[PDB]
Design a protein around this motif. Sequence first.
Motif, PDB file in Angstrom:
ATOM      1  N   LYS A 185       1.116  -1.322  -0.110  1.00  0.00           N
ATOM      2  CA  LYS A 185       0.126  -0.142   0.124  1.00  0.00           C
ATOM      3  C   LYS A 185       0.855   1.259   0.197  1.00  0.00           C
ATOM      4  O   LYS A 185       0.867   2.869  -0.505  1.00  0.00           O
ATOM      5  CB  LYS A 185      -0.813  -0.119   1.001  1.00  0.00           C
ATOM      6  N   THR A 186       2.407   1.120   0.551  1.00  0.00           N
ATOM      7  CA  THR A 186       3.290   1.787   0.980  1.00  0.00           C
ATOM      8  C   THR A 186       3.185   2.281  -0.982  1.00  0.00           C
ATOM      9  O   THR A 186       3.282   3.495  -1.117  1.00  0.00           O
ATOM     10  CB  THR A 186       4.000   1.567   1.628  1.00  0.00           C
ATOM     11  N   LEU A 187       3.211   1.058  -1.583  1.00  0.00           N
ATOM     12  CA  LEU A 187       4.026   1.296  -2.875  1.00  0.00           C
ATOM     13  C   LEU A 187       3.124   2.170  -3.314  1.00  0.00           C
ATOM     14  O   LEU A 187       3.847   2.917  -4.493  1.00  0.00           O
ATOM     15  CB  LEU A 187       4.568   0.148  -3.743  1.00  0.00           C
ATOM     16  N   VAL A 188       1.333   1.875  -3.887  1.00  0.00           N
ATOM     17  CA  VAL A 188       0.590   2.666  -4.026  1.00  0.00           C
ATOM     18  C   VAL A 188       0.488   4.213  -3.709  1.00  0.00           C
ATOM     19  O   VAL A 188       0.393   4.499  -4.283  1.00  0.00           O
ATOM     20  CB  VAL A 188      -0.733   1.561  -3.954  1.00  0.00           C
ATOM     21  N   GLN A 189       0.519   4.364  -2.295  1.00  0.00           N
ATOM     22  CA  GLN A 189       0.290   5.409  -1.866  1.00  0.00           C
ATOM     23  C   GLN A 189       1.511   6.826  -2.631  1.00  0.00           C
ATOM     24  O   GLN A 189       1.225   7.335  -2.739  1.00  0.00           O
ATOM     25  CB  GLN A 189       0.493   5.649  -0.759  1.00  0.00           C
TER      26      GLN A 189
END
Lengths: 382, 382
Positions: free
Chosen positions: B39-43
């Motif tokens: 989600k980090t990568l997404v955000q």
Amino acid sequence: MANRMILNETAWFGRGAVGALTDEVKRRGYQKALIVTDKTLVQCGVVAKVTDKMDAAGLAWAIYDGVVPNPTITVVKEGLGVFQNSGADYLIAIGGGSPQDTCKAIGIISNNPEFADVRSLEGLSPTNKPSVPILAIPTTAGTAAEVTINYVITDEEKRRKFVCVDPHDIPQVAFIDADMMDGMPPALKAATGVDALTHAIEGYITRGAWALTDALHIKAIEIIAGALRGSVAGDKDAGEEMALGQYVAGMGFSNVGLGLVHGMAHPLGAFYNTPHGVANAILLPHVMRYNADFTGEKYRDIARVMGVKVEGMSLEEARNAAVEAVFALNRDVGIPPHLRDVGVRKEDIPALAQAALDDVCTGGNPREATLEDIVELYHTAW
Amino acid sequence: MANRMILNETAWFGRGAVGALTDEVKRRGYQKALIVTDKTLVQCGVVAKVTDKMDAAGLAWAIYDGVVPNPTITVVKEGLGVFQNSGADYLIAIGGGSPQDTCKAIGIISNNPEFADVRSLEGLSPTNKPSVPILAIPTTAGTAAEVTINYVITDEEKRRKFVCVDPHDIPQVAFIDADMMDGMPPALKAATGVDALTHAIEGYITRGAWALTDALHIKAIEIIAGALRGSVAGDKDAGEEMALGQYVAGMGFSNVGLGLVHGMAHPLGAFYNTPHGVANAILLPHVMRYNADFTGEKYRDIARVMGVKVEGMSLEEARNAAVEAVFALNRDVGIPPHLRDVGVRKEDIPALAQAALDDVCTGGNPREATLEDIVELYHTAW
Ligand SMILES: NC(=O)c1ccc[n+]([C@@H]2O[C@H](COP(=O)([O-])OP(=O)(O)OC[C@H]3O[C@@H](n4cnc5c(N)ncnc54)[C@H](O)[C@@H]3O)[C@@H](O)[C@H]2O)c1
Ligand SMILES: NC(=O)c1ccc[n+]([C@@H]2O[C@H](COP(=O)([O-])OP(=O)(O)OC[C@H]3O[C@@H](n4cnc5c(N)ncnc54)[C@H](O)[C@@H]3O)[C@@H](O)[C@H]2O)c1
Ligand SMILES: [Cl-]
Ligand SMILES: [Fe+3]
Ligand SMILES: [Fe+3]
């Protein structure tokens, strides 16, 4: 721009790597294979080495030993022919670059019938389908056709050797073992050997060169340089090394190109059946000079990994050592120094030059070459 | 016996290699993709970098950002789940070793339902079918999961990180571009980077080691050693260099094994959530010592390519220079020197030692290790 690398998704190395074939086949459920080869190879019991294992493992196979040195469009067609009537699932290429380059040709056309002519497959052959699965089993210290995404065919009609490049060539599995290559007479070991050396050097200085490519090439040179001699002399251990070095060289130049040495050698093939190994061998040093200035520190490394104590030399110094180490090797391996020894004719220099000028490989040369520059080369190589 | 090599049949390198993605998908008509990620990568707008290009190219995609550092069986199941309900033709792994190792897990089980468990998939995973085509896009200076034939999962239940190995895992294409990795905070670049260095060194001295693999590893070490620092300090070009080195290392160790450093680091992960990178980092030097004597001239080479002038050194001398060069880097890179700093307990060492003794990687160590020997190690590393 970004760089692309195309390697065998699977490969086997070392004496007896051929043993792993039967399983690779099973593991991926193939039913029948078309062996593409020489008659020389079948007679010398080299193919037997594989068919026998396949037999014991109960694997179906059919043979096509119609390939000849410097495979012609007619051979490629005959093969595709033999292929289409075998219930063959895949093909196995046992042999040097000829049966191997033939095999890739057959695999591509059998799925891209579009290109049945085989002219139309030069340059970046616009194929939409990946070739029939092919297992590469080299029997020579050169070509590295077992990993390169490229094949060259001879158009007898148009006496010109044309290169084909397509990521769809690439075998599913390559089996690299000196056992299959022990049969090579000294002259053949030396020739293929130097071809590989040529491959390595031209790829280290080709235009697409970069980090990974450079690393690979320099290593291959290193290996080849320190073994071709002993291999040509018979040392089986040195043979195993050669088998590897030629393969490494392929991992690089395949994905980055070559230069004039190859561009100036193909026409020589098409014109006088001059063995590619020998052709490159003869040119290489000369072409290297012609390129010396446009290769930064490259030759320094080349000279080094070839035994030359480049310590304290000037870049110019090193550049000569490198070219010289080459001349030194060809002589030590039995390769004729001049093109005149291999029957090249001056009256043809102009023709060849043009042939080379156009040849796909040439474009990769670090230093642009004009028809005249090449003419000059062929002469100073004669 | 022979050595088998398993590489990416296709790989792209360099700033913007992700651009070549959309096309690859097309040149091989897939239909839909499941993006496995964080989600980090997404955000952080990092996945966007890819989804945006796919969208523009009109490519269908579905995401799954449920992955977490040191992925658990539940994560792998949840993914397989999401995948089995998406119309997902193939999957794209965007992220470090976690989303990538998760992705390979999902790809294998989705074709070998036989192992919906994920314990039944450790060691040499007896899979009968190749995983769902997976496109690997790394976002870190380490793992190299994009080219290795192995993924590691966490069995939260039986808290032990287990390694799964299977040639079927291997992505069909790998896209290596520092652009995806630029986001890594310095501590992350440092950690994953040393993991890469760890891979290179362990694979250079692992038991299966041989010619090709030694060449690859030593080159990787060279690259990593000469860039990690700059990358961590912010040099984007040093970042591009790292991206390559870590991949290169993968080309080697995937196909030959590692050793104790990884065997002793995994249990540390499972026990204290210690970042794989920092764990390896801390151990490495110590394990190197415990190993020095059983690595021939290896360390001499290691020390050299790390800037150490191993010139008038004795093998003993050099071996120490090597181990030292490492300690030197960890410091320079900001990695804590003791396991005590990362919360490792001394009551648990006996547990870990056992865990390490059982870890698959361990067996590759050049020097056999006994539970007690490892205990010794964990202590002298604490
Ligand atoms: N485009 C490129 O970059 C590139 C690079 C290298 C080679 N090539 C092509 O590759 C081909 C050269 O292939 P090659 O050099 O292997 O030769 P080859 O296979 O064309 O001929 C080799 C000859 O040696 C014999 N032979 C082969 N393997 C043997 C073995 N193990 N033991 C005993 N005898 C053996 C064969 O029977 C044959 O007569 C040419 O067609 C050349 O144009 C192209
Ligand atoms: N079998 C082996 O040889 C081997 C080798 C190395 C690691 N592993 C395993 O792989 C995993 C290692 O994964 P990892 O450390 O590369 O990372 P990861 O993906 O597991 O976790 C990285 C963390 O960093 C963040 N991150 C990742 N890329 C980023 C970027 N570009 N910018 C900003 N933040 C970013 C993520 O969001 C995440 O929180 C571990 O679970 C480890 O156990 C196995
Ligand atoms: Cl039959
Ligand atoms: Fe050649
Ligand atoms: Fe690791």
